[model samples]
Target chain A: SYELTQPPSVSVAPGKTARITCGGNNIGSKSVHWYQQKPGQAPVLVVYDDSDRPSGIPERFSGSNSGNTATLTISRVEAGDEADYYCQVWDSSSDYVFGTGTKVTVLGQPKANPTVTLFPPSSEEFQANKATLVCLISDFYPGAVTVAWKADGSPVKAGVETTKPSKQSNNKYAASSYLSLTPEQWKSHRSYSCQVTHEGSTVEKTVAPTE
Target chain B: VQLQQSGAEVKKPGSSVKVSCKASGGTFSSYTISWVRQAPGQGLEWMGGITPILGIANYAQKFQGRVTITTDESTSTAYMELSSLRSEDTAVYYCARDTVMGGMDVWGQGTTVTVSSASTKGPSVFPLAPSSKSTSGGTSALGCLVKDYFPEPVTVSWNSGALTSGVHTFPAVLQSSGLYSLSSVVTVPSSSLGTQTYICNVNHKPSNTKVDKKVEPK
Candidate 1:
């Protein structure tokens, strides 16, 4: 029930040129491969079969087929060619079938918003009654962010844990989120917040719970 | 060149697990040892690769017939079985080190495959990169806190070799000594801040341990 079709995203800028496309029905009989994961890592195999280019993947990353569609084309696109591009094919029962991904943003690069910090709940977790709250999330830029958790304002369904924005050795970008609680729910929830939304704005930080 | 990996399989739905990654510091037939997976929150899949001096193996044809990637240059290890399991084949299996200008520089602190059909419990154990980092100007942040994990679903992930704008993850809080506590944070992007080195893995699938901290390169 999952054939193939990509278009979840595709932006461009650095050097320019990024095309991605992959619909399927018969996909020109078959022979189309492309992968490039990035963002935590794993999944790299730029173009195979249809356009070939393995060894070190770089020919500006190319690949194309027509009729049922299947294209990749990356030409200039830099910023390390961004990431998240997939397009596999081999169905008709032969198996293999991916393509529901395509997030190749290379735009101007450099964007920032994240410098939040909220730490509280030590005292050995308040004498072992359970309590763990830490929210760092510093320096940001095009790293995609969206952390949420509140207590006095609602939201925050159950314990939370977020981590996926990482790249700092000075490459700008960081992430962290945690909010377990039970010091009697942090003294009956006096106040606790740590919301961040980057790229569309939304930065919050509130911590309270003493004694 | 570190790719240990192997441990953590609660199989049952049809049964079959066999994992391994063993490499140790270098030359296991010279690089290229892929096999990545992560299916719970979904993302990261590329199941194919094995080139132990041309013993050749390349899958990802959606995981050819269940899955099978062999390698053992006399123990440089790199197995991977997967056979018939279901439950969507659970997930949390990794074995990276496929770089040549590509990605994955070295990793394998992961291996949590649970294909259960009923009884299951064994995937909570974290400690190996407890976490720490800090920087100012232009921005830099790294802090990790994972305590005695238990069962409330643990799969904290992150890495830094490139591609990191910022991140946040939180969802395993079941303390009271019953184990389970998780937190994550990552930032650093003054258009490419440096000093590098950043990580904080942690995939507790009932002791399928895969901790990995290393956040000190600020």
Candidate 2:
């Protein structure tokens, strides 16, 4: 049995260097690999066999191991380089040992609010006695936000589904949420609202029953 | 190892629900399974961790007595039961693989548990009036738009006495969300525009509340 530990986060200015170290027992005997994961994306292998960069990977990332630890070093960090890095090792017991991820932040990245809009249910949904409200969130930075739904000022939990924030063409992030309710329930409440919270601030857009 | 989670559940207040996560693809007892919860539209909170083989369990201090987590070795499954549920318990629960790596590497798809209840929300008021001295076609107009008021049969009135000629109040329009919005527009003769102030008053029946705004379209 083995475990690994890495820093929870590391922040470096652009054009500076950042180092992520993974510490665990017997790490020197096993080959270590490093992965990069951005928000909403699958982990991508960047370094393997401790120091070999995969094809298409830039030269800025290098891996090394010393004593009982493995390290991934990023030189001249870029804004696009901000992401979570994880180190893993395969032991003889066939168990995969993964390090606590390290989030790399490149300083000076812009933070922006999402443009939020809430769309009311359509005719067909109403006819079916099922209503769906869509809250569209667009043009946000850092790719992290929480979506919430409210019925008459009370938070709603059932029938709420939200998507992961996706990267937009403009490099900002976007996401959407759906709130489903029965027509009877919809008609009984005086209003429904969609709230998008980003960077510690919340923006709300509400829709009421219209005839 | 693979973790399989149970389906979603909906329960009422004062009720109880049990959720399960079954481990497969390898020996389950050799590792630990940890539980995490995320309240509706909120961030994650760690509930506890348990090692099935040793029957050792550790819980978040707040959940020590309110929640019970147990494992059935024969089924390679872990169970969590929340007692006397409430609205705050409405969240998604997850079971994850805990290993020597110091973090969870595998996770089961989350199971959502919803606690049902009804609640109230108030309205937002936006009163638009000319801030600077301005005249349009020999008159000035002021508007009050009240939105997102619930269980509402609302009444909007102009405080300018009974000058019905140039005053219009639209009926409360029901939005698709079951809430109401209404707008009232009052026109002032250019002669009295800057001299008098107009007040827009909204009355929400359910709450028996009054929201009023005064504007002098100067």
Candidate 3:
């Protein structure tokens, strides 16, 4: 008759370690599982039932428990690891409960409240040549936003894209997007926007193609 | 070690039943559980496997849509459910520990489920168009570059409809560069010009989830 819940929320730093605590009233009666979600790709399991390894799991992810509280720890956080961390409990019965996710933020040097960095930002200038545009947004909350290409206030297609919110230093959250597009579209500056929406406010930024 | 499975009800034929075997060995939470299927006379079909510790599931290309494998560390048991069962579903289902070779090397004895008066044969494979597209220029040809960033070791391959003798394949490679990246090359025929469609597939260990892409001439 009870459920699983995450801590109020906390922050961590980039390149450092972060831990998310999943608490349940009846956790001692069941096992806990951990999952990681980044932009685009489906969620991947980081920890299972506190401390088990699924076949080919790497060593970076680890899990531990104390009393009814389960902990999932990620070591040496990377830019790509920013995303929401979720814990789940599979009851012997036919029911699975998920923990309220904890968002991770990777902090930059300093004064960069919402750090935005793009990878492979420059590409060959051609017409309709497929390419990728990745936007890394660190130190934020509540994984809610969109990546769009806007021309004169109109929205353009982002092709295929995904966003993931992760944990970082100082108990902050970081999110990123990988956008696929063609070369022709990249040249048209002021026609694209990486729109991030949270708590009802929308943040839109226009990006120019690099030579 | 005893692996008690969750019981499932088979309502109709072709309506398959899936059960899970929770590990009871030394540390059930640290290892991987493999799901294998055994039919009347055929060998075990390596359906897929999941790592409770890692929280990932890998399915064989053939079992993607038909079967779903999940686990609950809380219960220390993994779940294997067959969606549509038929006479073909009347087999002994099992969940075991997966080996490094991407096979269910450690298997549970198996829990037998009988699908009676069913219509569907069993899980069917629905193949899609090749994922990777072929691109070439100035005698330089590139088939597809498939990368798998999760778990660890990944496998890549290219097939022309049916299995043929001496088509072309490259050695599977691995790197310590953060996440894993794998690439394979295949030459295109000059006669069959224009845009050729090729599939770029990545096989991940531990979870066994496969990510595929279809590349076309740019």
Candidate 4:
């Protein structure tokens, strides 16, 4: 049997750094992992095996475990870091367990709104029977943003990849998304929208193109 | 030890639902069962839990006032009851094996609950924390977006003052996770641009909650 825990909450000024603490009892040689849960999204892997971060995650986030304690660190915390963080470990009985979470909130007010732009494929793409679209998002703070696609009113999916929000020189964030389809699929679809969701709000822009 | 859970539930707002967990494969009289809520597609909330031997209880502040957690030592069961359900209360409830490590270790099957609401959300106003003002083509616009808290058709009226020309509103959208999102954009003529203050006053009809946001000129 075992237990894992952390402080309930912590606040940090915008662009500051914060450390969330997690500890386990009787862990013995097991590894600790960290997850970040934003208000409307699923739990995202922040750190695995205490120090390893999955691809697409920026270097700003890191984790470590020494003794019974595991620490998840966020460098230059921003409004986007406002979410609940949890730690997971394998218990003595080999049971997967999660720790009590800590809500890490960015203290200062940041009014970085999302600005979305779109680009359609080139003439070469139109002739090659394949179409690619990109959605670029920038000037957003805290870097946590949601992006979704729709085709002619229905949802569009698959063959899409969104980059992790990267910090900019202004301390804001920028991210991009890519969607691919056959030129026929693109033509039949007629129009597509890229919806950018952030801070409990959403903004979308729709575009259709023809060569 | 293994744990078994009850079936799913679809209930109404203002109604109540109960969840059950029956432990199997070990000392039935040992271990504590903690009940946690995982909102349909989101994070977990520690509702409360009970010790099979002691029957003691504890809860999270967000749920303490609305949920009742109990245990049956004889049947080796843990139960959670939720009352006055709201749309946000809709989630999957699970019973987990408590351990010395603090967070729950092993977990039982989930009980998915759906709380329907006849009464819609009343738009409560809060700052659009990440909102912005932009200028383009000799015109500037500011957007005020809101979360239709707690569900159902909700609308906000511009009560503070009359809006400028060409004001536009994007209808509330139903999110997959069950929350509603709404937005409004106010466009001012380039001629009227002066870094003045603009406020959006909204009335949340459901709870009669009044919330507003402002953009002051720098």
Give each candidate's interface RMSD in Å. 13.4, 13.8, 16.5, 14.5
lDDT (10s digit) by residue, model 3, range A1-211: 2466786445567778878888887575567767665532234566676677666666767888767888888777665667667776655342345666776655443432454433333333122254545444555554344544454467655353443344454445555554555666555654455666655665665555532
TM-scores of chain B, in order: 0.25, 0.53, 0.47, 0.53
- On DockQ, the leading prediction is 3
Pitting candidate 2 against candidate 3, the one with the higher TM-score is 2
Error of 4 at A72 (Å): 6.8
TM accuracy, model 3: 0.32
TM-score of each: 0.32, 0.46, 0.32, 0.39
lDDT of 1 at B121: 41
**Regions of candidate 1 where Cα sits further than 4 Å from its true position:** A1-34, A38-45, A49-60, A63-73, A76-81, A84-109, A122-133, A142-174, A177-211, B1-149, B152-180, B183-218
RMSD of each: 18.5, 16.0, 15.8, 18.7
Candidate 4 residue B103 Cα shift, in angstroms, is 3.3
- Give DockQ per model, in order: 0.03, 0.04, 0.05, 0.03
Error of 3 at A149 (Å): 3.7
lDDT of 1 by residue, A55-86 (tens): 77778888988788888899888888888888
In model 4, where do residues sit more than 4 Å from their true spots? A1-69, A72-85, A88-211, B118-218
lDDT winner: 2
lDDT for residue B167 in candidate 2, whole number 0-100? 57
